[PDB]
Amino acid sequence: ATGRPEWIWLALGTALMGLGTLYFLVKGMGVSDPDAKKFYAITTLVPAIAFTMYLSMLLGYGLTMVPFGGEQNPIYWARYADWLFTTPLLLLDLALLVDADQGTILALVGADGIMIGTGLVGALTKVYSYRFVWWAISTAAMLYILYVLFFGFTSKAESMRPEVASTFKVLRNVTVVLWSAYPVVWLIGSEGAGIVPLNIETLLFMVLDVSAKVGFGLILLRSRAIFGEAE
Ligand SMILES: CCCCCCCC/C=C/CCCCCCCC(=O)OC[C@H](O)CO
Ligand SMILES: CCCCCCCC/C=C\CCCCCCCC(=O)OC[C@H](O)CO
Ligand SMILES: CCCCCCCC/C=C\CCCCCCCC(=O)OC[C@H](O)CO
Ligand SMILES: CCCCCCCC/C=C\CCCCCCCC(=O)OC[C@H](O)CO
Ligand SMILES: CCCCCCCC/C=C\CCCCCCCC(=O)OC[C@H](O)CO
Ligand SMILES: *C\C=C(C)/C=C/C=C(C)/C=C/C1=C(C)CCCC1(C)C
């Protein structure tokens, strides 16, 4: 018996990420269109990275104890190593779908790195009140990203192939609804106010992670928008 009550959700998350990796890897076999190859490679790497980090949490490697509030608090730091590499890849899927300009992609990836990097600092900070200063900076970086996705990409997708505009609009709406939930769980969870216990928080993140990575990929890779217009 594992002593951590949240282990059942880490085990399920590891299995779904693994099955998602294998499904995408087999579906991509034989795809020869170079454009589709780009989206298969980016989208298959997302669950493959998350699989190794969920496994590290399940085995206890990606966990550490952070003193704050007079209590040793168990912080899963492996979540941020996961998100550092998977969240910019998800943004690249959207940016390449709309043929975004290079300067915009750099702005998105750079703000994404600030978002995850300050969230890591906030999770490891020992002065309790300062943890919410880093939460606020990270959340401001996210709001810059959400703005670009609505008032920068949407304007350009509408001037492209109808299948690209329709698929982008769906993946854009999914992204904004799912990404906006992460700061709320972090704030009321063990990393912040501590109102939700760690076992329920782990359940919430696992549902969000699978929907935002596997659910996101199932919508993208079944669409014709990833293929170049050909006869
Ligand atoms: C798509 C099909 C799948 C649908 C799945 C979506 C569900 C997402 C998970 C939700 C939160 C549930 C958390 C369980 C509630 C536990 C809270 C509780 O009862 O705590 C009691 C405490 O002892 C006294 O307050
Ligand atoms: C039980 C199963 C557990 C889950 C599996 C273990 C994951 C770790 C292993 C391998 C990395 C394999 C390669 C990952 C890179 C995939 C990129 C890709 O396939 O892109 C296709 C593109 O079209 C090509 O040009
Ligand atoms: C397109 C870009 C593709 C990017 C592909 C990158 C995927 C790498 C994945 C995983 C291993 C992560 C391991 C992180 C190493 C942490 C080890 C550490 O520093 O631990 C310190 C201390 O010993 C204990 O707390
Ligand atoms: C956590 C930090 C590490 C991970 C961060 C991920 C950043 C990935 C790199 C670059 C974006 C630079 C612009 C790349 C966009 C090029 C798309 C394009 O416009 O087409 C040109 C392309 O060469 C086809 O011809
Ligand atoms: C645009 C989409 C993304 C937006 C993301 C930003 C949303 C920030 C929301 C709320 C602050 C609410 C804070 C409430 C925390 C109070 C906890 C507390 O101290 O109360 C203890 C508890 O009530 C005793 O049981
Ligand atoms: C792999 C799945 C997704 C959708 C991951 C998204 C992560 C975030 C939106 C993280 C947000 C954070 C902020 C803005 C503030 C608290 C710390 C976080 C890093 C969790």
Q: Scanning the structure block, which residue is given the tokens 């997302």?
A: 46
Question: 181 in a domain, yes or no?
Answer: yes
State whether the beta carbon of 83 lies less than 6 angstroms from ligand 6: yes
Question: 212 in a domain, yes or no?
Answer: yes
Task: Give the residue among 107, 81, 113 at the shortest CA–CA distance from 95.
Answer: 107
CATH code at position 68: 1.20.1070.10
Question: 204 in a domain, yes or no?
Answer: yes
Total structural domains within the chain: 1
State whether the beta carbon of 112 lies less than 6 angstroms from ligand 6: no
**DSSP conformation letters of the chain:** --S-TTHHHHHHHHHHHHHHHHHHHHHTTT---HHHHHHHHHHHHHHHHHHHHHHHHHTTTT-EEEEETTEEEEE-THHHHHHHHHHHHHHHHHHHHHT--HHHHHHHHHHHHHHHHHHHHHHH-SSHHHHHHHHHHHHHHHHHHHHHIIIIIHHHHTTS-HHHHHHHHHHHHHHHHHHTTHHHHHHHSTTTT--S-HHHHHHHHHHHHHIIIIIHHHHHHTSGGGSPP--
- Could you tell me the maximum CA-CA distance found in the chain, to the nearest angstrom? 67
Within a 10 A sphere around the Cβ of 170, how many other Cβ atoms? Answer: 13
**DSSP conformation letters of 35-94:** HHHHHHHHHHHHHHHHHHHHHHHHTTTT-EEEEETTEEEEE-THHHHHHHHHHHHHHHHH
* Resolution of this entry, Å: 1.8
218: left (phi over 0), alpha (psi -120 to 50) or beta: alpha
Task: Please say whether the beta carbons of 107 and 48 come within 8 A.
Answer: no
Domain of 26 in residue numbering reads as: 7-226
Measured CA to CA, the distance from residue 193 to residue 160 in angstroms comes to 45
Task: Please say whether the beta carbons of 141 and 122 come within 8 A.
Answer: no
User: How far apart are the CA of 29 and the centre of ligand 5, in A?
Assistant: 45
Task: Please say whether the beta carbons of 152 and 105 come within 8 A.
Answer: no
Instruction: Identify which of 57, 85, 91, 93 to mutate to test ligand 3's pocket (most ligand atoms within 8 A of the CB).
Output: 85
Question: 67 in a domain, yes or no?
Answer: yes
Measured CA to CA, the distance from residue 83 to residue 128 in angstroms comes to 23
Question: 69 in a domain, yes or no?
Answer: yes
User: How far apart are the CA of 1 and the centre of ligand 6, in A?
Assistant: 31
Question: 74 in a domain, yes or no?
Answer: yes
Question: 2 in a domain, yes or no?
Answer: no
Ligand 6 atom 6: residue of nearest CA = 179
Q: Which ligand lies nearest to the CA atom of residue 142 in the structure?
A: 6
Measured CA to CA, the distance from residue 108 to residue 123 in angstroms comes to 23
Measured CA to CA, the distance from residue 73 to residue 64 in angstroms comes to 8
Q: Which ligand lies nearest to the CA atom of residue 182 in the structure?
A: 6
**Ligand 6 atom at shortest distance from the alpha carbon of 80:** 19
Instruction: Identify which of 22, 44, 214 to mutate to test ligand 2's pocket (most ligand atoms within 8 A of the CB).
Output: 44
Question: 231 in a domain, yes or no?
Answer: no
